[PDB]
Write an enzyme that holds these catalytic residues in place. Sequence first.
Site, PDB file in Angstrom:
ATOM      1  N   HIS A  38      -8.953  -6.310  -9.509  1.00  0.00           N
ATOM      2  CA  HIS A  38     -10.115  -5.919 -10.298  1.00  0.00           C
ATOM      3  C   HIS A  38     -10.118  -4.422 -10.580  1.00  0.00           C
ATOM      4  O   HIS A  38     -10.503  -3.993 -11.673  1.00  0.00           O
ATOM      5  CB  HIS A  38     -11.397  -6.339  -9.581  1.00  0.00           C
ATOM      6  CG  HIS A  38     -11.566  -7.823  -9.477  1.00  0.00           C
ATOM      7  ND1 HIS A  38     -11.879  -8.613 -10.560  1.00  0.00           N
ATOM      8  CD2 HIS A  38     -11.458  -8.661  -8.418  1.00  0.00           C
ATOM      9  CE1 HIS A  38     -11.961  -9.874 -10.174  1.00  0.00           C
ATOM     10  NE2 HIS A  38     -11.710  -9.929  -8.879  1.00  0.00           N
TER      11      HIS A  38
ATOM     12  N   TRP B 131     -12.083   8.143   1.362  1.00  0.00           N
ATOM     13  CA  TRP B 131     -12.138   6.689   1.247  1.00  0.00           C
ATOM     14  C   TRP B 131     -12.057   6.027   2.614  1.00  0.00           C
ATOM     15  O   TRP B 131     -12.928   5.236   2.987  1.00  0.00           O
ATOM     16  CB  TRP B 131     -11.009   6.204   0.331  1.00  0.00           C
ATOM     17  CG  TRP B 131     -10.635   4.753   0.473  1.00  0.00           C
ATOM     18  CD1 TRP B 131      -9.804   4.207   1.410  1.00  0.00           C
ATOM     19  CD2 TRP B 131     -11.064   3.667  -0.357  1.00  0.00           C
ATOM     20  NE1 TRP B 131      -9.696   2.852   1.217  1.00  0.00           N
ATOM     21  CE2 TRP B 131     -10.461   2.496   0.139  1.00  0.00           C
ATOM     22  CE3 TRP B 131     -11.903   3.573  -1.468  1.00  0.00           C
ATOM     23  CZ2 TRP B 131     -10.669   1.248  -0.439  1.00  0.00           C
ATOM     24  CZ3 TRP B 131     -12.109   2.332  -2.039  1.00  0.00           C
ATOM     25  CH2 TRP B 131     -11.496   1.187  -1.523  1.00  0.00           C
TER      26      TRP B 131
ATOM     27  N   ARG C 202       0.807  -1.210   0.000  1.00  0.00           N
ATOM     28  CA  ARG C 202       0.000   0.000   0.000  1.00  0.00           C
ATOM     29  C   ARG C 202       0.844   1.266   0.000  1.00  0.00           C
ATOM     30  O   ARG C 202       0.285   2.366  -0.034  1.00  0.00           O
ATOM     31  CB  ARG C 202      -0.949  -0.003   1.203  1.00  0.00           C
ATOM     32  CG  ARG C 202      -2.212  -0.826   0.983  1.00  0.00           C
ATOM     33  CD  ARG C 202      -3.127  -0.806   2.198  1.00  0.00           C
ATOM     34  NE  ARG C 202      -2.584  -1.576   3.310  1.00  0.00           N
ATOM     35  CZ  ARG C 202      -3.307  -2.338   4.120  1.00  0.00           C
ATOM     36  NH1 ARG C 202      -4.613  -2.471   3.959  1.00  0.00           N
ATOM     37  NH2 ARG C 202      -2.705  -2.985   5.114  1.00  0.00           N
TER      38      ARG C 202
ATOM     39  N   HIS D  66     -20.204 -27.102  -9.817  1.00  0.00           N
ATOM     40  CA  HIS D  66     -20.422 -25.727 -10.268  1.00  0.00           C
ATOM     41  C   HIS D  66     -20.186 -25.589 -11.770  1.00  0.00           C
ATOM     42  O   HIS D  66     -21.007 -25.003 -12.493  1.00  0.00           O
ATOM     43  CB  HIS D  66     -19.504 -24.790  -9.475  1.00  0.00           C
ATOM     44  CG  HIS D  66     -19.335 -23.431 -10.080  1.00  0.00           C
ATOM     45  ND1 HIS D  66     -20.344 -22.776 -10.751  1.00  0.00           N
ATOM     46  CD2 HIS D  66     -18.266 -22.601 -10.108  1.00  0.00           C
ATOM     47  CE1 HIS D  66     -19.903 -21.603 -11.171  1.00  0.00           C
ATOM     48  NE2 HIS D  66     -18.645 -21.472 -10.792  1.00  0.00           N
ATOM     49  N   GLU D  67     -19.063 -26.126 -12.258  1.00  0.00           N
ATOM     50  CA  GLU D  67     -18.731 -25.968 -13.671  1.00  0.00           C
ATOM     51  C   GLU D  67     -19.718 -26.709 -14.561  1.00  0.00           C
ATOM     52  O   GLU D  67     -20.122 -26.190 -15.606  1.00  0.00           O
ATOM     53  CB  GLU D  67     -17.299 -26.431 -13.949  1.00  0.00           C
ATOM     54  CG  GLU D  67     -16.270 -25.954 -12.939  1.00  0.00           C
ATOM     55  CD  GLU D  67     -15.903 -24.492 -13.091  1.00  0.00           C
ATOM     56  OE1 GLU D  67     -16.418 -23.831 -14.013  1.00  0.00           O
ATOM     57  OE2 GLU D  67     -15.108 -23.994 -12.269  1.00  0.00           O
TER      58      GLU D  67
ATOM     59  N   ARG E 108     -11.515  -8.842   1.301  1.00  0.00           N
ATOM     60  CA  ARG E 108     -12.618  -9.330   0.482  1.00  0.00           C
ATOM     61  C   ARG E 108     -13.273 -10.552   1.108  1.00  0.00           C
ATOM     62  O   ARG E 108     -14.503 -10.660   1.133  1.00  0.00           O
ATOM     63  CB  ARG E 108     -12.125  -9.652  -0.928  1.00  0.00           C
ATOM     64  CG  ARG E 108     -13.230  -9.693  -1.966  1.00  0.00           C
ATOM     65  CD  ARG E 108     -12.674  -9.541  -3.367  1.00  0.00           C
ATOM     66  NE  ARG E 108     -12.138 -10.800  -3.869  1.00  0.00           N
ATOM     67  CZ  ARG E 108     -12.870 -11.761  -4.415  1.00  0.00           C
ATOM     68  NH1 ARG E 108     -14.180 -11.639  -4.548  1.00  0.00           N
ATOM     69  NH2 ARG E 108     -12.274 -12.872  -4.835  1.00  0.00           N
TER      70      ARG E 108
ATOM     71  N   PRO F 208     -10.223 -24.101 -12.951  1.00  0.00           N
ATOM     72  CA  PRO F 208     -11.487 -24.731 -13.357  1.00  0.00           C
ATOM     73  C   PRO F 208     -12.368 -23.816 -14.193  1.00  0.00           C
ATOM     74  O   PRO F 208     -12.874 -22.806 -13.696  1.00  0.00           O
ATOM     75  CB  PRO F 208     -12.157 -25.074 -12.022  1.00  0.00           C
ATOM     76  CG  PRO F 208     -11.063 -25.114 -11.026  1.00  0.00           C
ATOM     77  CD  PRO F 208      -9.972 -24.212 -11.504  1.00  0.00           C
TER      78      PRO F 208
HETATM   79 CL   LIG Z   1      -8.558  -2.054   4.552  1.00  0.00          CL
END
Ligand SMILES: [Cl-]
Lengths: 596, 195
Positions: A486, A458, A150, A355-356, A254, A327
């Site tokens: 992303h 932020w 960071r 799933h696939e 995440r 996969p």
């Molecule tokens: Cl964070």
Amino acid sequence: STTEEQAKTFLEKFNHEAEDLSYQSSLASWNYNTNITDENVQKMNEARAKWSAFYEEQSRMAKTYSLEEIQNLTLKRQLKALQHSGTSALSAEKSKRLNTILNKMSTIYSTGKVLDPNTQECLALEPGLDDIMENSRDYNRRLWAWEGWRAEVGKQLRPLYEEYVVLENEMARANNYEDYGDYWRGDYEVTGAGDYDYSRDQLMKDVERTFAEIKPLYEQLHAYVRAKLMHTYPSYISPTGCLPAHLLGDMWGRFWTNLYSLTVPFEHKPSIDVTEKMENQSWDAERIFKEAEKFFVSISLPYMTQGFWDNSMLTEPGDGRKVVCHPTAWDLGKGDFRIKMCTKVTMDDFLTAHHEMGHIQYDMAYAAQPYLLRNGANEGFHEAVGEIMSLSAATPHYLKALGLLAPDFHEDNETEINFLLKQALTIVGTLPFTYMLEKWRWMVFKGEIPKQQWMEKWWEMKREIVGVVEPLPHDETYCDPACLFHVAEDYSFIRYYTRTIYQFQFHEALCKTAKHEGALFKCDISNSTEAGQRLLQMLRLGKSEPWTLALENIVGIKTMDVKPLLNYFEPLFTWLKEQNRNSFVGWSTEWTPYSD
Amino acid sequence: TNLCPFHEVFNATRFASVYAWNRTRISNCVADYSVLYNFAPFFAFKCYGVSPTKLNDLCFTNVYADSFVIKGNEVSQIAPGQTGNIADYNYKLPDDFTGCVIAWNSNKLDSKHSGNYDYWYRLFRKSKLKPFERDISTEIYQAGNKPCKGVKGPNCYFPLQSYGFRPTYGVGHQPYRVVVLSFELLHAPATVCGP
Ligand SMILES: [Cl-]
Ligand SMILES: *[C@@H]1O[C@H](CO)[C@@H](O)[C@H](O)[C@H]1NC(C)=O
Ligand SMILES: *[C@@H]1O[C@H](CO)[C@@H](O)[C@H](O)[C@H]1NC(C)=O
Ligand SMILES: *[C@@H]1O[C@H](CO)[C@@H](O)[C@H](O)[C@H]1NC(C)=O
Ligand SMILES: *[C@@H]1O[C@H](CO)[C@@H](O)[C@H](O)[C@H]1NC(C)=O
Ligand SMILES: *[C@@H]1O[C@H](CO)[C@@H](O)[C@H](O)[C@H]1NC(C)=O
Ligand SMILES: *[C@@H]1O[C@H](CO)[C@@H](O)[C@H](O)[C@H]1NC(C)=O
């Protein structure tokens, strides 16, 4: 001198002539991701160059035909996609620089190392540094080990992303848009239909209302996690407050799965681990998905074609080829359906195969639709549809039916509590972070905040709804959101937020027709031919008709709600409320950790 | 009885496109339709007009045959009284035709690696093909107010398109050899009669 037959014939010629250039272009990519070498990449690029030019030159002639004179709805729906152009709208400079900027961001994210310890230990980002983040138990180690990403990559990527924002703000407005947020949200707009109309401004209100009803569960889970982490790590993390940015397993926060070891409901008991029942009783890789095909047949869905068991790669290369296997389930075009996956004998590969196969069957369902409509209703249907059946195949009732579990086994309360919490740690741990990131992206694309206060806002408005605090300040010299892959590669993040809601509504709607009485977290969908027909009705619809008609066909409610999601986690809430009786739920944002 | 065309019309090496079928007039011959079972495991044998039980003892004046090479989804389109994209622009059958239809799969021969471009099927045509009508000469289709002037471009396209044939296509897009047999009645001493 017809005015609509011209459009009809042009679309027919495009449909009939764009399949040869696409099948052989996709086959080149497939052959690339089976033996990576000098010739295969050359062939892949050579086949993709033959289709990029064709697609760039067909739009220029599709744009001539107006979208006002045309009347038949299924013609306008197909023509709208081709009318819309892409990066071939800005001038020569603004594209020859945008492509360079994008490639530079990809390269600078790819390359990165830090040197915290002795000079010889210049551990790169992956996989050693990721492993030491997801396995260590310390404070100074994590802080001084991941202050690097960071503060170095962020510094590298500040100016390029600052320029990218203003360079792509004046790219959507060429295609009749307000800002990049409108272009991003345009994937859901459907107009021209009575009583089925969903503007971009409605999606904002839908998301803001959907997020409001998941706050109690997240607050209770946050209180439980904080109470456990106080016990685990002493002298830090104040008993009432917010969690530090690091220390939460994954870097960007995440996922919360890596804290499962830290926070377990009931110790000294084993969770369901069907891996020795697959080892003592010999079970190879072919039957692993043969039984999955059997399950798909049992739910009354079509078999798998013979053009799948001869050529598809389903195991280790074992012949000297070098391939990186993740996969997937390709759809090569005219009747071809192939799956590439390195298979090993565990639950993870079994559920991944489920799933696939589920989403490749979804892909095969709408094969009759034209080329321009061979996709899901929206960008979030494929993943949710695939994940529904992986979730349904994880039940102990279906596992017992298949013979993998002991007949003389009774599901205890502790084991089901542990299962529910294990699913919750990974499901509800991504929703408020995904909503956070998408809201910040939208609000910064609209230009609401100045460019002089980018990280202050932020952090300040992430500490409110995510409740994650950050050690030490960052005075507009550290591009923090750039660390995610992303964000750097310009990928959509809304799909992950809506996929969970869609799948949790689909599960309840599907298992209400299956006539299952009892709890919802042990519900199973097998031997339910009528339910399979109900699901196939939605699956075969394709993208011709607007996705909300598909929603009404499968469920019957136009809007999306969280009550089906809350039905799954009702026992968890009931137990957690009893667990928290001497704690204070809440993340009052007053304390800070950077007090020297 | 002596090398009747009922076998030598099936074992031909190269067939024709769907819009240039090679019609053959069957001369004096014996109508042994039960020996065709010794040529391959047919995929489609259903046939209209007369039930197959009565076909053992029958006699007609002259029998005509047509040969194509077609895909899989369009095999059901060759049935009489149907509408579509090949059954109305390349080969239309009369509603009450008293003949039989046979089609068998040929993908190990008709499809080559790296694509086989030797077959065609028309797509653009102004009027509607009347039953038992043929047309091979192509003209640049006029789909615009501006005249075609013999060239392509805006609104002027090329009708014929090559059938993409690959050895990895699904059952739907596998080439299928098709032969259509129709019976004709006249007012002359008949020639072909079954045994
Ligand atoms: Cl964070
Ligand atoms: C490895 O590369 C060769 C190149 O000749 C090609 O056959 C294919 O991509 C791979 N072969 C095998 C057997 O995996
Ligand atoms: C639009 O055209 C298709 C044929 O391409 C036709 O099937 C459909 O019925 C038409 N739409 C309406 C509303 O009739
Ligand atoms: C479906 O029915 C069969 C009937 O024999 C049964 O053996 C199987 O366990 C069932 N599948 C379930 C309950 O998931
Ligand atoms: C599970 O349910 C049983 C039912 O009697 C109860 O005795 C036990 O305390 C429960 N365990 C929990 C809620 O953790
Ligand atoms: C048409 O039939 C004649 C006589 O059998 C044959 O010689 C000729 O080659 C046929 N055409 C094709 C396409 O083979
Ligand atoms: C076609 O010709 C070949 C070579 O004469 C022969 O082996 C085959 O039996 C013939 N086809 C039939 C009638 O099955």
